[PDB]
Amino acid sequence: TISSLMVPRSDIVFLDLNLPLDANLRTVMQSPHSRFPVCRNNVDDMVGIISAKQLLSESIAGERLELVDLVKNCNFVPNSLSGMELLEHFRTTGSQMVFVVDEYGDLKGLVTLQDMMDALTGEFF
Ligand SMILES: Nc1ncnc2c1ncn2[C@@H]1O[C@H](COP(=O)(O)O)[C@@H](O)[C@H]1O
Known part of the structure; x- marks a missing residue:
């Protein structure tokens, strides 16, 4: 049931190392999120994560x-x-964000500690 807590890959807001610094800046400026997955070309080549506060x-x-x-x-x-796992x-x-893959190794989405x-503290379980 871990799928229901997931941010689906289509809803992921991400930065692209193959794009100009300015385009990524604008992506960040147009979002409230504190952290952004960073990839190359597309989300199936994830390189890691960036703190918005640091970038800015x-x-x-x-x-x-x-x-x-x-x-x-x-x-x-x-x-x-x-x-539980x-x-x-x-x-x-101690991660804030983890990436979830299916059996093909393909990215399905992400989960945050916040979520x-x-x-846990709502009525989910
Ligand atoms: N980079 C992101 N892309 C898509 N959804 C996100 C991202 N960061 C956070 N979220 C979602 O927004 C919630 C609040 O995160 P934040 O906006 O950083 O406070 C998280 O618990 C996720 O549900």
């Missing part, structure tokens, strides 16, 4: 900025994980 901080800073330098590591998990993966890793906590 270091942009407003005016320092020589290359997007690839702010990328942080991203964890993948199978879509076959149970709710997913929860424990979050606690163990995981909302589901």
Whole structure:
């Protein structure tokens, strides 16, 4: 049932290392999200994740900025994980965001800690 807590791949807002820095800046400016998955060309070539605050901080800073330098590591998990197993993966890793793949290794979506906590403290379970 981990699919229902998922942000589907079509709803993922992401940055593209193959695009100009300015286009990614605009993507970030037009979204409320704190963190963005970063890929190359498309979401099936995910390279990691970027903090918006950092990107913008270091942009407003005016320092020589290359997007690839702010990328942080991203964890993948199978879509076959149970709710508990997913929860424990979050606690163990301390990750805010994890990527979910199907049996072909293809990206199905992402899960956030935030969404995981909302589901625990609401009426989900
Ligand atoms: N980069 C993103 N793309 C799509 N949805 C996201 C992204 N970041 C966060 N979300 C969703 O928005 C919620 C709030 O995240 P935030 O907007 O960063 O406070 C998360 O729990 C996810 O449901």
